[PDB]
Design a protein around this nucleic acid. Structure first.
Lengths: 197, 97, 121, 102, 86, 25, 129, 216
RNA sequence: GCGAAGGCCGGGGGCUAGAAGGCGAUCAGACACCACCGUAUUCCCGGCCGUAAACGGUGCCGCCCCGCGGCCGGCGCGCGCGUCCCGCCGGCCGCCCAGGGAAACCGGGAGGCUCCGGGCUCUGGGGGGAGUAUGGCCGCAAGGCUGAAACUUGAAGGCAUU
């Protein structure tokens, strides 16, 4: 059930774009290659992944158990807004190893789900997930390593416009399943809040 | 213990390579194993270059550059610090330092 | 030739992140007076107290003269919050700015919706 | 108490471990017991059993420690026991470096 | 029926019956710490809202180290109707 | 090279035995 | 070149199960492979096997149900006394109750259990559990 | 003093939300509290023996420091075994570290019938094998008439598993004890991860029976 | 059958280096390292010889096996259109998830192996004695190839840690 408004926003957002390097796991999602070399994503496949992630994200009884981790400076605002507009527990910047496994660690969350901006950048959390049975969802690019990631969303994840709009789009669907949004009317929260200047 | 995958040499799909001579030690080294640095340094020093350019009575003169490929043996090169012993992990690392 | 120890640095940084308003930027003595209050902090000795005060007057100059890392000040925290919360008044972001990749038009065609009847180029 | 407990021939580790407990319970943050001599052997050795953090140097050490030296006598020879107990809460003042900052 | 070891009587004597994951089908170990169970909700009819009828897909740590879960999740989603085959 | 020099020294002993046998013959 | 074809294919089936791939393509096809696959399908360790017939040796595409631990060939195809087939099972197969040693008999290719049922000895094609 | 849970699993265990130890093993959950093992095993804990302490030394400028590593096997007599090792300068503290670690790594053991099934699993369910360092031990299902046939260290952990009869065969540096017991530990953790035909029924999808789902 | 170098038998050659040798120095002594000189040799032809850390220290013929790139030799798929892209590749390679190992490390295998069996040929069985003794064969020689025993003895060895 793709919506025209978000797709036109994605066209400005460049979510339809990916790095020239490409991976076989994400080959299904990608549509083609620009003659410049840049890889162009299938927007509807991204939206189907975004809606799928929402269904998974809501199941957890406390939306405080999903953990949003970003070390990318650009994504920090996105995952903090998402944690504020929704109810996720933010673990931004350096993840601090043993956060998910060390009980005597200053923060020792036991999350039921994980959220990652970049598979390579936020690698510490995805390894930590393995030690304590935590599934993970990530914002993957065209070349990414899907190791230890249960579901991945095809997106730039290096574009501030793309990172912010994706988190906004994800937020809209997660609370839509809880009835706190509109469905067929625009969310009052705007995508420019998720994006840093 | 095999210290290096290369085995110290870049001979691949080969059995024998040209012998070369350490420029200081005058020793015979396999061409692949030799240091093989290259210098394009000019003939006269940078300071002398201004004095010589003012002295030259021909217009458009530029200092001639001198080109040589310095090949040194492992013992010769490490001693004069052309290359350096590296840490086990830093030995794997390549690239000009 | 005077490098402060961790204890001096740690105590001074709590003093600044809490009583920033009491401290003054260039004068050690006003900062030393704040250290002398005792209700704010317990400082054993005169030299120990002077060192915490001296670092705290440098910290006070530094926090007014640009942000200092690791300094938890509530008033500065509000200042970023209004800046972060404010988004463009007309919310001008995508603004229906269109612009596609040549390959993207074919991908949009692949879905079959064909946004804007292929006038996206 | 240790020197006389050691005489009944109790385990030397157990002796120190029991004494270590009664000092920490009485409040000492730092407890140190070192028994040195020809223990269960014909050769010298020193056996430090310690529970907690003890200051070992400076002016605080003079007023904040309780070093007591006794010389046990044994058929093998003298196996002197040394016990040092450190109390930060000495009520005479505060540790020179202890910044309360509350 | 009654997965486990049925005795000569037919009583199950296999204590806890391990979980064969939804893709690879290898039994989840007693100490298989990377086993992950992720649940996707069903939108209830018209409304874009939950029904508390979420279906749960288990994923063993062997196919997760491979990274095979994202593809396996997608295929299995259409098998349980959480997506269209496209 | 002790092993290379040790092989050389066995060779010499082998020649001495081989030649001594001829004188004995 | 390929002297044993069953072994090369069975190794591929086990290798695909390791990387969790349902469908495998076996490049060499044979009647012994055909029968070995049929017996595994009956015991449900493998699912339907479809042979793409070619004008040459033939290839088989086998759908796997993810339920085979290991398969194997015995080279050479030894002679087993019917009485000592139990010894072959005790060592090669884990547990007398579970696992199948696949034999060849003048009556036909048969299961170790069926071989015991009529007490006929034979040659071991291989083994699957 | 008493136990105060620092782990979410511990809080559920303290409440009594988790009925059996096996429930956490269905979800293959880590046990980070030895106190949780006591909750399911409160009378005399589990049978634990300290099987040989080997002195270990690090050369230093002054001399060789000495630290002790102890290997402890915690187990009951039925489908529950744990092996851990602990390093401490004081032998006693190291024995405690091993026993606590062994409690943190309790693992279920399958158990089964060699050829004849009566009322009790009397032997290992399969030819379970494991390898720690050079050593490799294979535990072969044995008839109920046969006893557990293994060397004294491996027999000890096979008694704690409660495998009444086994035909173990060990190859490698079995003389190295730590490595030998570790192989007999990894063989028993393999038992509950070996797919067998009886386990081919298809299901799961518990959802509310999930241990993460439970809440204080 | 072929086989680096050194050597050898006999010619051709003979610049350069340079096993021998001689001489300076250097040292307590160097007759060694460093100068300097220089015979055999180094080069060519006709034979020998049959060895090298002749090493990827990893036989050969297969079968499957995951990513990430590079290079070289063909061949296609297209595309404005370029020694571009994308495959198929035949090899040469780097890195590596599983997997393997005592580990170093391999992962184009050293994987698919105690859950041990595709086929073939070779080799090893604690260390010395000993690659010696003796017999054979081959060589002009130097030697090479085959190859013990008496006796002696608790380690030798691998890879890693401090």
């Amino acid at each position: 059930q793709l919506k025209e408004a978000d797709v036109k926003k994605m066209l400005v957002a460049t979510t339809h774009l990916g790095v020239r390097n490409i991976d076989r796991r994400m080959q299904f999602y990608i549509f083609d290659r620009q003659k410049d070399g840049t890889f162009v994503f299938n927007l509807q496949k991204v939206w189907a992944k975004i809606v799928f992630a929402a269904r998974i994200l809501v199941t957890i009884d406390d939306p405080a158990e999903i953990a949003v981790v970003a070390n990318r400076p650009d994504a920090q605002r996105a995952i903090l807004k998402f944690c504020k507009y929704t109810h996720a527990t933010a673990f931004p910047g350096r993840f601090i190893p043993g956060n998910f496994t060390n009980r005597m660690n200053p923060n020792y969350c036991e999350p039921r789900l994980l959220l990652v901006n970049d598979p390579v950048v936020d690698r510490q959390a995805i390894l930590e997930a393995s030690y304590v049975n935590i599934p993970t969802i990530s914002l993957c690019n065209s070349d990414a390593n899907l190791k230890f990631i249960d579901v991945a969303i095809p997106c730039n994840n290096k574009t501030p416009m793309s990172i912010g709009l994706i988190y906004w789009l994800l937020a809209r669907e997660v609370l839509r399943l809880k009835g706190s949004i509109s469905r067929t009317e625009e969310w009052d929260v705007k995508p420019d809040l998720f994006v840093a200047l | 213990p095999v210290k290096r995958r290369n085995n110290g040499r870049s001979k691949y799909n080969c059995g024998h390579t040209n012998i070369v001579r350490c420029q200081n030690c005058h020793r015979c080294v396999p061409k692949d194993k030799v240091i093989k640095r290259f210098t394009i340094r000019n003939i006269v020093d940078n300071t002398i270059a201004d004095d010589v350019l003012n002295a030259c009575v021909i217009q458009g003169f530029a200092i001639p550059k001198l080109y040589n490929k310095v090949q040194y043996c492992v013992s010769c090169s490490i001693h004069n610090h052309i290359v350096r012993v590296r840490s086990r992990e830093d030995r794997k690392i390549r690239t000009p330092p | 030739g005077k490098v402060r120890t961790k204890t001096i640095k740690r105590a001074a940084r709590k003093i600044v992140e809490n009583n920033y308003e009491s401290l003054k930027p260039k004068d050690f003595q006003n900062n030393k007076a704040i250290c002398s209050k005792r209700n704010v902090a317990i400082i054993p000795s005169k030299r120990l107290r002077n060192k915490v005060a001296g670092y705290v007057t440098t910290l006070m100059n530094r926090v007014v003269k640009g942000p200092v890392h690791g300094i938890s000040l509530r008033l500065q925290e509000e200042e970023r919050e209004r800046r972060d919360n404010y988004a463009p008044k007309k919310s001008e972001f995508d603004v229906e700015n269109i612009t596609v990749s040549g390959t993207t038009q074919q991908m949009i065609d692949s879905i079959g919706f064909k946004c804007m009847s292929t006038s996206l180029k | 108490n240790l020197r006389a407990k050691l005489e009944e021939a109790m385990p030397i580790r157990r002796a120190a471990y029991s004494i270590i407990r009664t000092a920490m319970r009485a409040g000492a943050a730092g407890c140190e017991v070192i028994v040195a001599g020809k223990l269960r052997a014909q050769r010298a050795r020193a056996n430090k059993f310690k529970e907690g953090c003890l200051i070992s140097t400076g002016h605080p050490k003079r007023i904040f420690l309780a070093e007591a030296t006794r010389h046990i006598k044994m058929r093998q020879g003298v196996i002197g026991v040394k016990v040092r107990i450190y109390n930060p809460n000495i009520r005479g003042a505060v540790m020179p470096d202890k910044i309360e900052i509350g | 029926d009654d997965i486990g070891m049925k005795n000569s009587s037919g009583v199950v004597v296999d204590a806890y019956i391990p979980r064969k994951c939804s893709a690879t089908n290898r039994l989840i170990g007693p100490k298989d710490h990377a086993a992950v169970q992720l649940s996707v909700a069903r939108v209830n009819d018209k409304g874009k809202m939950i029904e508390n009828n979420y279906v749960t897909f288990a994923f063993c740590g062997a196919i997760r180290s491979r990274g095979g879960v994202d593809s396996a999740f997608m295929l299995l989603a259409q098998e349980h109707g959480l997506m269209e085959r496209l | 090279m002790r092993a290379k020099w040790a092989k050389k020294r066995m060779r010499k002993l082998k020649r001495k035995r081989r030649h001594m046998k001829a004188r004995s013959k | 070149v390929r002297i044993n074809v069953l072994r090369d294919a069975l190794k591929s089936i086990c290798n695909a199960q390791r990387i969790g791939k349902k469908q495998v393509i076996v490049r060499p096809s044979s009647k012994v492979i055909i029968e070995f696959l049929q017996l595994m399908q009956k015991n449900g360790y493998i699912s339907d096997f479809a042979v793409v017939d070619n004008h040459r040796s033939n290839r088989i595409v086998v759908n796997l149900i993810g339920r085979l631990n290991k398969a194997g060939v015995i080279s050479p195809r030894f002679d087993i006394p019917a009485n000592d087939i139990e010894k072959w099972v005790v060592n090669l197969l884990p547990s007398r109750l579970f696992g199948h040693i696949i034999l060849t008999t003048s009556q036909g290719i048969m299961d170790h259990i069926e071989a015991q049922h009529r007490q006929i000895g034979g040659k071991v094609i291989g083994y699957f559990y | 003093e008493e136990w105060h849970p620092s782990t979410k699993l511990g809080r559920l265990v303290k409440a009594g939300k988790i009925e059996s130890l096996y429930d956490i093993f269905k979800y293959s959950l880590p046990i980070k509290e030895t106190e949780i093992i006591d909750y399911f095993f409160p009378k005399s804990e589990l049978a634990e023996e300290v099987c040989n302490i080997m002195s270990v030394q690090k050369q230093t400028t002054a001399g060789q420091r000495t630290r002790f590593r102890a290997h402890v096997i915690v187990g009951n007599r039925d489908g529950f075994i744990g092996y851990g090792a602990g390093v401490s300068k004081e032998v006693a503290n190291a024995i405690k570290k091993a026993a606590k670690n062994a409690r943190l790594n309790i693992v279920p053991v399958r158990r089964g019938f060699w050829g004849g099934k009566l009322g009790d699993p009397h032997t290992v369910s399969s030819k379970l094998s494991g390898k720690c360092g050079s050593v490799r031990v294979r535990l072969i299902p044995a008839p109920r008439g046969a006893g557990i046939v293994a060397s004294p260290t491996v027999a000890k952990v096979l008694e704690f598993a409660g495998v009444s009869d086994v035909f173990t065969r060990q190859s490698g540096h079995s003389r190295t004890l730590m490595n030998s017991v570790g192989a007999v530990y990894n063989a028993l953790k393999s038992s509950y991860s070996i797919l067998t035909p009886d386990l081919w029924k298809k299901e799961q999808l518990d959802h509310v029976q999930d241990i993460r789902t439970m809440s204080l």
